[PDB]
Amino acid sequence: KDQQSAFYEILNMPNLNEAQRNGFIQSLKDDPSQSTNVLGEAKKLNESQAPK
């Protein structure tokens, strides 16, 4: 379920571009055991790329 919820959130993060969203989604497919950490880094990039 941590895979599943993370996929959805990453999909709808407003401040990632397509290449980033697609790469994080692939990482979730690649290694589901890292789902929480992958979501954490997607969140970090979503925050740092917030529009100014």
């Binding site: 790469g23 692939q26 990482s27 690649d30 290694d31 890292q34 992958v38 880094e41 997607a42």
Partner: peptide
Amino acid sequence: FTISRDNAKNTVYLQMNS
């Protein structure tokens, strides 16, 4: 980064994001 392997193709991958 995530590491993964495909046995059928005998390949290992490193996805590198951010």
